[PDB]
Ligand binder design. Structure first.
Ligand code: 017
Lengths: 99, 99
């Protein structure tokens, strides 16, 4: 589809057998999701933006479905104010910016 | 143009007669630039990101050219980790997400 930017580009995703809402975020290097109890091992990481850094748990090779498009890759989990699908997964669904 | 997301969607912008590099950021409502001298009146404001809130100077109705596309709108100046072009200007240059 085509998504205009009048409002936040929020879409439904499916991750770990759960449905959530997330932003399609071209400004996010990596996908970051609200606190959720995913199984498997993980690695500590800190990610920075406006306001400073938050601590997140890095899970690798996580399957996510974004508008029926499947992708699998890194998912960071932590106390983020919003769920963002970052470029690491946006590339996998064929997402481009166009003007 | 059509911009893929294998690397950061960085573009050259012109603001206040100066060239700068900036990130096309669909997850940003607003446009936030690093500390710089901008001609015009400004008001102090707060803006919140992934790591908390920062103090910015709000400049209204500023001319800004993004990759050869003119916009006139609000620009926030403050200690952002990187220059981000948010939706308030992305809409003006006709930017959409497509997949
Ligand atoms: C600042 C960017 C270079 C990086 N950010 C993505 C960006 O889209 C955030 C994503 C975002 C969105 C909402 C809340 C927090 C973070 N937007 C943002 O900070 O925008 C602010 C300016 O406009 C306002 O509108 C939203 C917040 C304000 S980030 O959230 O900090 C981030 C950093 C690293 C990763 N892997 C993922 C995300």
């Amino acid at each position: 589809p085509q998504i205009t930017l009048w409002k936040r580009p929020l879409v439904t995703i499916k991750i770990g057998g759960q449905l959530k809402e997330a932003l399609l975020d071209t400004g996010a290097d990596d996908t970051v999701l609200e606190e959720m109890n995913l199984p498997g091992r993980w690695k500590p990481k800190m990610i920075g933006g406006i306001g400073g850094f938050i601590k997140v748990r890095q899970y690798d090779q996580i399957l996510i479905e974004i508008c029926g498009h499947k992708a699998i890759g890194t998912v960071l989990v932590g106390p983020t104010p919003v769920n963002v699908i970052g470029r690491n997964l946006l590339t996998q669904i064929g997402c481009t910016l166009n003007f």
